[PDB]
DNA sequence: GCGATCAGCG
DNA sequence: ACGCTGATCGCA
């Protein structure tokens, strides 16, 4: 029902300057994928390729490489990535539809090419699920429905470029699109394809010990509850500690007793088996997720993992990282921060520069509430966080702990994104009315904030909608629903999506700035990770020196804002050593 | 599959 | 009853 060539060969007129182009990786993880078919629409038709002979034809190959050949596209980093696993560049996307889709509306979900046409009311594709199939079922079809689905694909991308320009345009999203998410997403190509290399005999080495100190303190849970049980199992735990040593009973679950970390803190007092619990949980994360999950993913030739870092997840701009997830490595406790040891730079004679941005968001939230004492405190490049705990243990800054730091850290976020007088009360262990007291101390010195939170919530409930400072969106449809549940939840993401999201529009454009720099100054170096406002690269140790001067100072002048940006960068032989 | 839990980001 | 995530695992 839809005409195309189901060619054999590449011909002239599959090489337009201007094209849709599906390269259709059917595999969630598209690292060493296959491709299973590819289409272009053009000017001239709607054509069907079978890789086999479009990628081992030259001219096709060089069309792919060619910056002034025009491509659209829907997830261009998937056809990108894959096509680098095949060895060939995919250059000249200026048209991405997946990121389209994304800025316009992240609520979507948009997961395939029906769902964003779907938003332009253009129907004449089918979902990839009903394609494909899920699960066990899931299948390539016969190659006659397959060429249908992908020209379908295309001939929808070619049709929906100029709908979601225009309305991107009109939400002052083009910009975002064209210079900073499309660029980015080459960017995080590269990235994903470079990967990290792992030490694996470090880890596996790690992992031995590990089992030996799982069952030292899983011995004596045992003698501690003086039976055995699946210190696993919330079912028999819950009864081991609420019924069997008749532990007050602080929460609950929907199914029955909490057992989460900040109870069996509370619980410390009544008993030593809460605090083994606690270390053998912490122990058993390190040995599940960190040791086991990262030794499966590791490609064994190159000692590689190649994570996917998905640039249309998040509601809020963010990136994030699966399979593995690189963004969220141990490093808060030194136990479990050894695991970045294993994290070793790709070549000899090369290190890891790791740099970050401090307190981005409140130098974000001091900018975007021109709250003049927030503002001053960063033009005097203070550290909130340890004054905040000066303020909260009553002690000098020569005495704060990381321990204090890290609590006065979650109590700076908690309270300008609307933590309660109750759940502060909880979290520092203080009686309700001192939290209300401390939160309304901390608004009489930030004037500027509290009006920038009751702005911000007003301006949401007008226009429907919270914009960042470079013009991402989140729609809060909630903020006006009369379940007084639904609505809180609504105005706390009034609060923070803004300043959490313009934080997540300055990383990106230093990535972009960076990788600017660099090819310029005609470094090898090259990112590796992005931590939400962390950038990892490896480099040749001869380049050590340049980056520290070339790095902070791009991440320092991504943006400009009302207050400086700082940035603190350090450098070595791992992860681990690079802080 | 889901949700409690915990690792990270602020 | 601060926000944004992803992996693991028991399942009450
Ligand atoms: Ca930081």
């Given at each position: 029902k839809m005409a195309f060539t189901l060619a054999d060969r590449v011909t002239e007129?599959?090489?337009?300057?201007?094209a849709a182009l599906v390269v259709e990786v059917?595999?969630?993880?598209?690292?060493?994928?296959?491709?299973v078919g590819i289409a272009v629409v053009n000017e001239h038709g709607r054509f069907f390729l079978r890789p086999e002979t479009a990628l081992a034809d030259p001219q096709f190959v060089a069309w792919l490489g060619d910056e002034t050949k025009k491509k659209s596209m829907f997830d261009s980093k998937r056809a990108a990535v894959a096509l680098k696993w095949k060895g060939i560049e995919l250059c000249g996307?200026?048209?991405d539809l997946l990121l389209a889709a994304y800025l316009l509306?992240?609520?979507?979900?948009?997961?395939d090419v029906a769902a964003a046409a779907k938003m332009k009311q253009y129907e004449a594709v089918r979902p990839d699920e009903a394609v494909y199939?899920?699960?066990?079922?899931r299948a390539v079809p016969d190659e006659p429905v397959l060429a249908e689905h992908l020209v379908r694909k295309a001939a929808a991308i070619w049709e929906l470029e100029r709908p979601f320009l225009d309305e991107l345009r009109r939400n002052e999203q083009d910009r975002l699109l064209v210079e900073l998410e499309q660029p980015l997403s080459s960017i995080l190509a590269e990235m994903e394809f470079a990967g990290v290399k792992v030490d694996t005999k470090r880890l596996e080495q790690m992992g031995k010990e590990l089992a030996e100190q799982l069952g030292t303190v899983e011995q004596r849970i045992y003698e501690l509850a003086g039976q055995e049980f699946n210190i696993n199992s919330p079912k028999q735990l819950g009864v081991i500690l609420?019924?069997?040593?008749?532990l007050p009973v602080l929460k609950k679950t929907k199914t029955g007793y909490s057992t989460s970390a900040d109870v069996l803190e509370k619980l410390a007092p009544y008993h030593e088996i809460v605090e083994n619990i606690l270390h053998y949980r912490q122990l058993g994360k390190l040995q599940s997720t960190y040791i086991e999950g990262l030794l499966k993913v590791?490609?064994?030739?190159?000692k590689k993992v190649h994570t996917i870092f998905n640039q249309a997840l998040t509601q809020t701009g963010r990136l994030s990282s699966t399979?593995?997830?690189?963004?969220?490595?141990?490093?808060?406790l030194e136990e479990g921060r050894?695991?970045?040891?294993?994290?070793?730079?790709?070549?000899?004679?090369w290190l890891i520069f790791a740099a970050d941005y401090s307190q981005i968001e409140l130098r974000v939230l001091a900018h975007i509430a021109e709250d003049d004492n927030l503002m001053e405190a960063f033009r005097r490049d203070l550290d909130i966080h340890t004054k905040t705990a000066m303020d909260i243990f009553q002690v000098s800054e020569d005495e704060v702990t990381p321990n204090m730091r890290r609590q006065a850290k979650a109590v700076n976020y908690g309270i300008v994104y609307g933590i309660s007088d109750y759940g502060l009360a909880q979290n520092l262990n203080i009686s309700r009315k001192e939290a209300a007291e401390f939160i309304e101390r901390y608004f009489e010195s930030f004037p500027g904030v509290k009006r920038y939170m009751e702005n911000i919530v007003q301006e949401a409930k007008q226009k429907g909608y919270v914009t960042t400072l470079l013009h991402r969106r989140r729609y809060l449809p909630?903020?006006?629903?009369?379940?007084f549940n639904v609505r809180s939840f609504a105005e706390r993401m009034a609060m923070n999506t803004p300043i959490q999201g313009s934080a997540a529009d300055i990383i990106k454009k230093a990535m972009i700035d960076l990788n600017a720099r660099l090819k310029e100054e005609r470094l090898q170096a090259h990112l590796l990770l992005q931590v939400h406002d962390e950038l990892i690269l490896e480099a040749p140790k001869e380049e050590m020196e340049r980056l520290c001067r070339l790095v902070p100072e791009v991440m320092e002048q991504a943006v400009t804002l009302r207050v400086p940006l700082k940035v603190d960068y350090h450098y070595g032989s791992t992860w681990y050593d690079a802080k």
């Open positions: 007129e599959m090489l337009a300057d201007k059917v595999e969630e993880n598209y690292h060493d994928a296959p491709i996307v200026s048209f509306d992240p609520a979507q979900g948009v997961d199939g899920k699960g066990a079922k609420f019924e069997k040593l008749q590791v490609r064994p030739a190159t399979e593995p997830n690189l963004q969220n490595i141990p490093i808060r050894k695991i970045r040891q294993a994290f070793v730079p790709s070549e000899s004679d909630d903020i006006t629903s009369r379940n």
